Amino acid sequence: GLAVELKQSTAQAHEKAEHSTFMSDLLKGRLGVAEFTRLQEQAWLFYTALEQAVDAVRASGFAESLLDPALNRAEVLARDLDKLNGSSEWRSRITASPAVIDYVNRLEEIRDNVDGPALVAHHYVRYLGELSGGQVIARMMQRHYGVDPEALGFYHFEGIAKLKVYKDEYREKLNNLELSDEQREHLLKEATDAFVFNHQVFADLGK
Numbered sequence: 541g542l543a544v545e546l547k548q549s550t551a552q553a554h555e556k557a558e559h560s561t562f563m564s565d566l567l568k569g570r571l572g573v574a575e576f577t578r579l580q581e582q583a584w585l586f587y588t589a590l591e592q593a594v595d596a597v598r599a600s601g602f603a604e605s606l607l608d609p610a611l612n613r614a615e616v617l618a619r620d621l622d623k624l625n626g627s628s629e630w631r632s633r634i635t636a637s638p639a640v641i642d643y644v645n646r647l648e649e650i651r652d653n654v655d656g657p658a659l660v661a662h663h664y665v666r667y668l669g670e671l672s673g674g675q676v677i678a679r680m681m682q683r684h685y686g687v688d689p690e691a692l693g694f695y696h697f698e699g700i701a702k703l704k705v706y707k708d709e710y711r712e713k714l715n716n717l718e719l720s721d722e723q724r725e726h727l728l729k730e731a732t733d734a735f736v737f738n739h740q741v742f743a744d745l746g747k
């Protein structure tokens with residue numbers, strides 16, 4: 541089933557992602573709110589690009605049940621960032637890192653070419669990752685740095701009653717998505733590429 545193959549084909553990359561210098565330092569309480577904020581600003585840029593690609597691919601009729609609009613993060617993130625930065629000025633001030641530029645370019649390609657299987661891979665990497673682990677990151681931002689949970693709405697999914705039931709449903713949706721052999725190989729390749737993009741974002745953030 542595709543869910544298991546996605547997990548297994550990216551397991552090594554997931555492990556590298558848990559041990560990136562920036563993300564490891566952040567979660568162990570060795571950085572600070574400033575660094576968490578920089579993370580969230582870059583995330584806002586790529587979630588914005590991701591959600592345009594989602595919208596396009598959903599509109600095309602591909603993977604519609606998987607592409608649940610309750611997952612959308614960009615607007616919630618912007619409200620977090622308003623709280624973290626003290627105003628809405630950051631929107632006009634932030635600049636994409638080179639890795640974020642590259643990720644945003646790929647997401648815009650996926651959007652404009654309506655690359656459904658690519659989009660689903662990036663959807664899995666982002667949303668199932670935040671569904672799974674985002675609770676932990678949020679708890680640690682609060683515990684290590686005193687971030688108010690009002691600035692942690694990104695890690696809370698309001699439209700989702702029960703996360704464990706949700707993740708099971710999501711995996712089952714992956715398992716039922718009708719794909720040609722070539723579309724499936726592309727989806728799996730793209731999931732690897734999504735982690736590499738993520739790894740380069742964290743790399744830039746630690747530099």
Ligand code: HEM
Nearest residue numbers: 546547557558563664665666668669671672673676677738
């Ligand atoms: C930032 C880059 C990360 C990405 C893109 C990401 C992505 C993912 C994905 C896609 C899954 C689902 C695996 C599956 O069941 O198919 C997952 C699970 C998980 N993630 Fe990550 N992850 C990242 C970082 C982290 C970090 C730093 C931690 C440690 C706090 C973490 C903790 C976990 C744990 C414990 C699970 C197991 C399932 C669960 O907790 O419900 N992740 N992640």
Ligand code: NA
Nearest residue numbers: 645646649650
């Ligand atoms: Na291209």
